[PDB]
Design a protein around this ligand. Structure first.
Ligand SMILES: NC(=O)c1cccc2ncc(-c3ccc(Cl)cc3)nc12
Ligand SMILES: NC(=O)c1cccc2ncc(-c3ccc(Cl)cc3)nc12
Ligand SMILES: NC(=O)c1cccc2ncc(-c3ccc(Cl)cc3)nc12
Ligand SMILES: NC(=O)c1cccc2ncc(-c3ccc(Cl)cc3)nc12
Lengths: 350, 350, 350, 350
């Protein structure tokens, strides 16, 4: 039925916990009585995403309340909502839509874990976990907290944690040398570039499912342009906390998982002001966003090629930037490979 | 029974309407249970505001994370919210905080209608109505549907209806020549001030009972300063529709109330960009926001010592501004003196 | 000699100083020996204007050394310059191409005072002063150092003398009453507009002959819009010293002339930033640049009606705007009506 | 006579012609009468630097008119000028000082030359050439026209010659391989940095005597930051034409001198908008100005650690940058090792 160490089990389930996946669709106010996990789909969410963009060009170009209104109505039709007896919010405030973008985004992954799990259960193998874990196509290699590799990972978390995120705290618990389904032959031609470094990348536990079926993806095409500060692409941080801030956990759930991986940054194009990048300047490969504080460069290990900014993040010279901390964004899925997949508690400050 | 011309009665009961008030609070995601309508308090609200003002300051300074945490919990608790099955919408985005600034503004009058309501269950000289009528300390004397005034007033409504404001059609149902007791007395000084014209003012119907009672009021000190495009004051539009857009009358409640008052402006301070200010430049008595559309002035009829921009919408010749229509914002509750109240029906083309 | 008040004569002996003309040109580095005073022409200078304009819509719009080099040539050949053994300045520094604008302006005026100065002023009856007077086609009368009028002027002068302009002390020598032949008939329409004030206007003395003959003109079309802060129009001030800084007086020539005209402002367009107006917004009849300082408003007095801003300088509530002091620009020449022409002597601190 | 190859003999005499020195002094209107070479002085020029920056602070911090006038006086009273019969320019244009930064910069070297040229003149043996050659304390050797290096340097020129610089062609009259005494080891410590490359530097001929004897240096402490775009440092280009322009040659004086040095940039703090740097963001070594057009990135030609941008100039993604071409700044003089010296003729068609 099984064999995976306890920590692996406490994981394989979280990934397919069809229960939570519901409490999540609920959080976004969905009428789970017309839009259940069973009738989800990329191609549908995609239509949702597209409606959202036809609303960005709406306000911007200045559109008749009629048009603004129609749009908002279609969106709430192709994506049912359960408000109760309260007036359905408006979608013409940029902030309003962005809220929806975040929503539609966290959804994408969900459609996977289910449709991906709504089958494959026939050849009587082992306990439910094995039949799923197997389809992960990800050798969830195990790591020891008292050997070598992990030894370093310890340092990372501890230091890369911002002073402005003192609303909770971390506590290393599980390290697992995750290894995708041959994403190796993919990230190899992307060695031809300097700048190999391990950065974070947090998310919602309900998401870490498809993050393995076909790793970190970039906002599909139909996504709104002004949806991201540096455009549609994979985002990374050299500050654990900041990336943790993307786990979204409450007092009754101080236990989400994070991830660590290296990207082929090559020659990074660093901005200090928001820009919805479409094409990289010729010669450039990635984009860095200079924040007001940064892992002290004076100190930071490395090896095997990759680099690690694990120095008491101090204040950089940049002082006309909008960001508070750094950001790294590459625009080619094949320009990244996942190495380790942590997980720790968030014991807040209620 | 009653001694108010039929229409004036349908009005008394409409604004002093029991059920609607509760119908209005629920939709705001308020938990009637823990938040009993008969428990609203003038100070209980001003306490809420200040929480918001602190929530937007620290957010516009990327301060700490233990600010939104604590501050968010507090608010939702002071003002009992029943998200039912949804997750408490953190007020971090510094955007959903505005929708909150709004609600309170509303709650303010709701709170006044009630108190004012619950205070005359004693003597019984006439129908409940007439009793609640002597409470608005105002003279609501109907206007002869067929006369100059109606013609003027009605033509005003029709002419300054803006195009981009398509989704609803307007049709005057009845005009009321209101006269708040004493308003005439404090407005007296300001009539020696040049530049005073009839502008519009919309609002939810459950706020009128308190408006006719204590008149138009600025946001309290406690409320944020970045809550209103041009600071805390009494707003006015010269575009009927624009001001009607603030009645929030839906398919279910197709009729709202619009207020026509006389404003002592004088030396206006032009602006094309939103600028949250707390004071006027020397020699400045009001602030005027420039819209790309405005009433043609060559048609500014002068109701004896008062102007009326009944001039059909036209191009102002300004274009680098961020307003599609004008706004007038006074900062002394005395510079105002309401003259007309009107009932209208909204014909939606959704 | 002549039946003209001694004073009126000295004013004439002033404006009609030919030698002082060449002096100007010289200070500009012009080659009199190639461009003799008697060789000036309006089309020349005008055609010179377009070159500067052509540099604008070229220089900053991205250019080629060849062009700037070429256009700079076309310019310097068209208008001779003597720099001696020193490679002549190349037009492409904005501040550089800008002086040429300040240069050309002063030039267009010299030519007018010149062609006028000699067109038929050598008759029997009376001498030159008398003959050249009538050329001015403007009544000129003396005002007494005791007339309520003079007391207003003097008051207006000393009170509105800015504080940054501390490099000289003023002293009114001879006040004069004037009236251009047929300007009243030209100002009659606007004579019935609102907001009329006594604003200043400073100019180089050897320009007056043309002004008292042609009235204050607008920089010809062919001038780059960018060569002027608020588009091409007439400029006035409420700080005597702001327009006085334009009389181009040295110690050699410490006595200058300044104007007090009646301008029909109407609806001003309150701008605090700079823009190169080409068209005006509806209803607008002028533009008023906002400055950090301004005359005290409650100090405004009135002479014959016209609001005169003789109120001691005050800090305005508009601090961010570019201008340190106010400005007024009208774009139709008929909105101005010269009344008083002063004759004051600077006391320098150079 | 001199035992040095004639070509070298020409450069020594050229960069020591006391006449072309004076031609310089006059180029700036400097009064040679009351301000002759022999009277120049390190202390003097420096003191004017302080004044020059006084004009900066006082101008960007405001003040009044009387002060601006006094500082200029103090400047001219220090460095005598002869403005013929023109109006003595006023320094306040915030860039009218820039032209003075240039002057004072030149004056320092011009002064140096003269000083070296007199500390060892009354000697006897060979032509004063070998006498001045040794004073430079820098080995100079001719690079054979058909020397492999020659084909590379020339390639660089013809390739990195900007298209907007079409007001002159370029021909390499001479190529030199110089080696300043001492500079080989004060640079050694920076030979460990990364991104060491060949970059251009163009300056005045009368300026080279000191440059070879003191090496390229950064503006003094007294000197004002406002005089430079990215602060006091040593600048470089990768577009020979860009550096060419700084040789200030004319149809009269067509021959100029430009340098090729290998700068140790390391980790560049890349900007794209004018900024007067003070501190260099941690981890940053140099500064890079981004240009709209740039030497083809995939054409780089490395020479052991030292990269060479000889690729034709094409376009880079950057479009919001304020620059037309790249730029390079190091804020430590020891971070630059001079290598070659070209003597080239310009070819204008004017
Ligand atoms: N993923 C990270 O750890 C992460 C690190 C750093 C910056 C990020 N900026 C935006 C987002 C982001 C998160 C969720 C969604 Cl839906 C869109 C963008 N993530 C980020
Ligand atoms: N209501 C009007 O007639 C009105 C007219 C013009 C401008 C306004 N700007 C802001 C608000 C406003 C609306 C809702 C809330 Cl809660 C606060 C302010 N109202 C306005
Ligand atoms: N003329 C005034 O008295 C005067 C008053 C007020 C503002 C002005 N702004 C610019 C110029 C101005 C002056 C000379 C040149 Cl050549 C161009 C513009 N004059 C002004
Ligand atoms: N030297 C170059 O070829 C050169 C290349 C690139 C940028 C430069 N920016 C400023 C200056 C500069 C140097 C001295 C002075 Cl006085 C003024 C400007 N030179 C530069």
């Amino acid at each position: 039925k099984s064999k995976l160490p306890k920590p692996v089990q406490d994981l394989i389930k979280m990934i397919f916990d069809v229960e939570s996946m519901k409490k999540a669709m609920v959080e976004y106010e969905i009428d789970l009585q017309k839009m259940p996990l069973g009738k989800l789909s990329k191609r549908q969410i995609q239509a949702a995403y597209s409606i959202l963009s036809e609303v960005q060009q709406a306000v911007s170009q200045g559109s008749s309340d009629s048009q603004i209104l129609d749009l908002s109505n279609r969106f709430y039709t192709l994506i049912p909502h359960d408000f109760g007896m309260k007036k359905p919010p408006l979608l013409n405030n940029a902030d309003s839509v962005q809220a929806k973008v975040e929503m539609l985004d966290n959804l994408l992954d969900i459609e996977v874990a289910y449709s991906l799990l709504r089958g494959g259960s026939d050849d009587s193998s082992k306990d439910p976990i094995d039949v799923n874990y197997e389809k992960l196509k990800t050798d969830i290699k195990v790591v020891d907290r008292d050997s070598e590799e992990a030894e370093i990972i310890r340092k990372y978390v501890k230091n890369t944690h911002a002073t402005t995120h003192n609303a909770y705290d971390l506590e290393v618990i599980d390290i697992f040398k995750i290894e995708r389904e041959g994403e190796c032959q993919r990230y190899k031609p992307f060695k031809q570039l300097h700048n190999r470094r391990l950065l974070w990348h947090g998310s919602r536990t309900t998401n870490f499912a498809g993050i393995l079926s076909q790793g970190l993806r970039i906002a599909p095409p139909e996504a709104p342009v002004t949806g991201y500060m540096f455009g549609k692409g994979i985002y990374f941080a050299d500050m654990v906390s900041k990336s943790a801030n993307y786990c979204h956990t409450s007092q009754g759930d101080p236990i989400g998982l994070i991830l660590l991986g290296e990207v082929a940054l090559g020659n990074m194009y660093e901005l200090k002001h928001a820009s919805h990048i479409s094409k990289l300047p010729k010669g450039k490969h990635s984009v860095k966003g200079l924040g007001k504080t940064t892992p002290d460069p004076s100190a930071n290990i490395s090896l095997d090629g990759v680099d690690v900014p694990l120095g008491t993040g101090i204040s950089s010279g940049v002082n006309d930037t909008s960001l508070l901390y750094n950001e790294y964004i590459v625009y080619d899925i094949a320009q990244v490979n996942l190495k380790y997949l942590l997980k720790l508690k968030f014991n807040f400050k209620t």
